[PDB]
Amino acid sequence: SLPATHELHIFGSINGVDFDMVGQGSGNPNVGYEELNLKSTKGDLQFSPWILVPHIFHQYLPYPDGMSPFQAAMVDGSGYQVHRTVQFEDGASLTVNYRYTYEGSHIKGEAQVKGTGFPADGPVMANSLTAMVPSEEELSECFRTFDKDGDGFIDREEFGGIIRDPDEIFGDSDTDKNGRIDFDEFLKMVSMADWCRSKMACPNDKTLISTLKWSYTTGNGKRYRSTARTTYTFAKPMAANYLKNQPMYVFRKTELKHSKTELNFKEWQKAFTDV
Numbered sequence: 001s002l003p004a005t006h007e008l009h010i011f012g013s014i015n016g017v018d019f020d021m022v023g024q025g026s027g028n029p030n031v032g033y034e035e036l037n038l039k040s041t042k043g044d045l046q047f048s049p050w051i052l053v054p055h056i057f058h059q060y061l062p063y064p065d066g067m068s069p070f071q072a073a074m075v076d077g078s079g080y081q082v083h084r085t086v087q088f089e090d091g092a093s094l095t096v097n098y099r100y101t102y103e104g105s106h107i108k109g110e111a112q113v114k115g116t117g118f119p120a121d122g123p124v125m126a127n128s129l130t131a132m133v134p135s136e137e138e139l140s141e142c143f144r145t146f147d148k149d150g151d152g153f154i155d156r157e158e159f160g161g162i163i164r165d166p167d168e169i170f171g172d173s174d175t176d177k178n179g180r181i182d183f184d185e186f187l188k189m190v191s192m193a194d195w196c197r198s199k200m201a202c203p204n205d206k207t208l209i210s211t212l213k214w215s216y217t218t219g220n221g222k223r224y225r226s227t228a229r230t231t232y233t234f235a236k237p238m239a240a241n242y243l244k245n246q247p248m249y250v251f252r253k254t255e256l257k258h259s260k261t262e263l264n265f266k267e268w269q270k271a272f273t274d275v
C-alpha cells in the first residue's frame, strides 16, 4: 500500500556535538502532504533546529501521471536509499543518509546526519534561523510571472493577480512610495511565494539525482544561502516512464514550530513536468 503514517529517528553530530531525535508523523499520499513531531532524546539542541529542515519522506509524493518513483518503490516493497550533501555559503557542510523499512502503510525512517564547519558566531550555532525560503533566482521567476507586461515593476492592476484591504497592501509594499512594486519591494512583502523547487534527473534506471538551491532567513533579516545534491538509490529498476519524463520539478513548502527540544513540522509537495 501507499503510506499513511511514519516515524523518524534522526541523529548524528553538528560541529562534533551529538544529537538524537525521535517522533511520529502522518501524511496524505494523494496530495504530497506530511506532518511530523520530533522530540530530542539527549536534551537541548545546541544549534538551530531549522538546519534539520528540509531533512526531516518522498513516499508521500504523487506525480501528475500516477505515483512518484518513491511511491512505486514503497508499494512494491523494494524501496530505496538516500544520500544528501549540503553546502552553505560560509563554507559549512552537512550530509544526510536515509534508510527506510516498511510495515504496510507505516514508514520507519532512519536519518544519519554529519555537519561541520559552522562558524560558532554564524546563524546555525546562534539559533538565528527563522524560515526556509526559495533562492533569489526562483523568487525572481515568480516576480517576472506577475509582471505581465515586462516593465520590471508590479503595478496596481498586476498586483491583482497576486491577491488572487488590497489598496493598502499595495500601498504598504511600495516602500519608496513611487506608485508600484519593484522586485526588492516584492522580496520584502513576502504568503505563497515559499515554494522551493527541486530539479530531478535519472542517470540510470536505479538512480535519481535531485538538486536544490535555497536560503534560510535569519533573525537579523539576512539570507543564509545553501545548495544541496541528493542521490536516490533504487533496489529495483524504476519503471520506464520515469526515465523518459526527466527532468521533473518538485515545488515544496515547509513549516516548523520549535522549542530547543521539540519540533512540529509540516510539508507540502507538488510535482510538475515544467519549471
Ligand SMILES: [Ca+2]
Residues within 6 Å of the ligand: 146, 147, 148, 149, 150, 151, 152, 153, 154, 155, 158
Ligand atoms: Ca508590470
Ligand SMILES: [Ca+2]
Residues within 6 Å of the ligand: 174, 175, 176, 177, 178, 179, 180, 181, 182, 185
Ligand atoms: Ca516602487
